[PDB]
Write a protein that binds this ligand. Structure first.
Ligand SMILES: Nc1ncnc2c1ncn2[C@@H]1O[C@H](COP(=O)(O)OP(=O)(O)OP(O)(O)=S)[C@@H](O)[C@H]1O
Ligand SMILES: Nc1ncnc2c1ncn2[C@@H]1O[C@H](COP(=O)(O)OP(=O)(O)OP(O)(O)=S)[C@@H](O)[C@H]1O
Ligand SMILES: [Mg+2]
Ligand SMILES: [Mg+2]
Lengths: 284, 284
């Protein structure tokens, strides 16, 4: 499994043993179609292979992650759906078991009822709801990985307030400095009010065309912009036909290019862990 | 232009002459990828051909409609973007002119700042913002057509409160009775509080596979369910490779299948007008 990857996992497990509860990671950005749900699926898959105990959370009406995971894993309907769990103030009956390692709180269209549920609440109580209900679950997991909508909403606010770390997938050529700074301002707003320890892991570039001069050049410029803070991931995600195959048939390892495309996701995953480890080692 | 279509347009213009201001139409549903933005583009295109004076409103951070329209029309940047117009309490400087008939308020990523802007406002003042700023513009247009996000949010609430009629595109096989009723409950909530005259035009089926037994059968069942209220459109939208061509190159009429795919959109458009006319003829 490579020595360096083994060392990263040992270090993760050591940090988790010090923390004594899960680290919560959010994949988020306000553009659709940049691979947030796909990264989430591939992280679920990889963590299960690595025997990490993980809770995936699909906080999207569309339930994209849930339906995608169901291509590879047996995904049951939960006794109580995510929206009803939130309404009941307990998420315990909303968890399904994909493997002995991998759990999921599935998405449901009933999440559309959430903003009405919380309409009369204080902004604080609305925004802290997910965090409050995740708190008792964290001792049961190594990682909790949240996927949600791209539109600023009750969903995004809950996800951000519940998380320790945020991964930001984006297409460099589609974003401007202003876009990124505005998005970061949104995170800062919620961090200061409700979640001061929130950290950005970094930006995860998505490259839809490997033979595009403008795509290459915009990516170069993003790296330049973030030379000092080092926020741009060194390992990136490239569009692959293989992902389309896995989205139809389920994820496999025994076919041509399966292991090569898997290593692309693995390299992002491990870079994410490295970045988390560095931040955790710095921490209080 | 066919006699029956000419009669529908005369009747529209007669109704608009009685109203003395634009009718506002919203394409909305809480599932992504069902052709809301595409229908909006095709309605912009068709109305321009018919010399109807139309304001398109792209209330989406992703600006999908805006970028799509820019394939066919010259789309300038507005002096003041949509978010800043909302913040300034005037949308007049946020309008661009695509043709002598067709105007657009373009989408902008800066719309992400809206929920923070309105955070301290009453739910009423937050929800009525778009309607309030559209009011002075309506005398200048025959139709105002709004496209927005699929996620329940400040955006959806503003769009719904501003509109006279809602068109609901969906894939029948992807929805359940519960989904539709829950969505309709959301409309009802805002209708009762802020917009009692709001009418649903109907459901516009999107068929992604013409050779699918389950897709056909789910569509049949939806029609059965709505036998009495007649809410399901008789004219539907089918997936077409041509739409992919127009999305890359712009809309054309001089190529193979151009006019056939255009008539598909035209038939939905005219059915929409028929349905609006029937409701208007009933009205106060
Ligand atoms: N590396 C990849 N190669 C090829 N296809 C991909 C890749 N990553 C994602 N996709 C596909 O692109 C589409 C969008 O990816 P998602 O992960 O669903 O995006 P998202 O960022 O979650 O979008 P939302 O939730 O609308 S903001 C899906 O059909 C994926 O299967
Ligand atoms: N009839 C059609 N045939 C082929 N492609 C289509 C058709 N209608 C839409 N599309 C394409 O399908 C994709 C989704 O359509 P949109 O109109 O963007 O969906 P939407 O309902 O606006 O989605 P959101 O805003 O994420 S909820 C786009 O790439 C369109 O170009
Ligand atoms: Mg997603
Ligand atoms: Mg759209």
């Amino acid at each position: 499994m490579e020595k360096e990857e083994l060392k990263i996992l040992e270090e993760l497990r050591r940090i988790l043993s010090n923390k004594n509860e899960a680290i919560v990671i959010l994949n988020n950005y306000f553009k659709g179609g940049v691979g947030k749900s796909k990264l989430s699926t591939m992280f679920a898959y990889l963590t299960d292979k690595l025997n990490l105990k993980v809770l995936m959370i699909d906080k999207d009406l569309q339930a994209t992650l849930t339906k995608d995971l169901a291509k590879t894993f047996k995904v049951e309907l939960p006794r109580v759906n995510f929206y009803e769990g939130l309404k009941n103030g307990n998420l315990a009956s909303s968890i399904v078991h994909l493997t002995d390692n991998l759990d999921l709180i599935p998405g449901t269209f009933d999440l559309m009822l959430l903003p009405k549920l919380t309409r009369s609440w204080t902004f604080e109580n609305e925004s802290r709801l997910l965090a409050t209900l995740l708190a008792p679950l964290k001792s049961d997991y190594d990682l909790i990985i949240i996927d949600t909508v791209p539109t600023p909403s009750v969903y995004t606010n809950n996800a951000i307030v519940a998380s320790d770390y945020v991964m930001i997938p984006l297409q460099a050529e589609e974003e401007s400095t202003n876009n990124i700074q505005n998005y970061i301002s949104y995170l800062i707003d919620l961090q200061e009010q409700f979640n001061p320890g929130l950290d950005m892991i970094g930006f995860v570039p998505y490259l839809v065309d490997t033979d595009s001069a403008t795509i290459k050049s915009n990516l170069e410029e993003l790296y330049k912009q973030h030379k000092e803070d080092n926020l741009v991931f060194q390992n990136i995600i490239k569009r692959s036909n293989k992902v389309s195959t896995w989205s139809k048939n389920g994820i496999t390892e025994h076919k041509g290019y399966d292991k090569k495309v898997l290593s692309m996701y693995k390299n992002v995953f491990f870079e994410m862990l490295e970045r988390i480890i560095q931040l955790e080692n710095e921490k209080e």
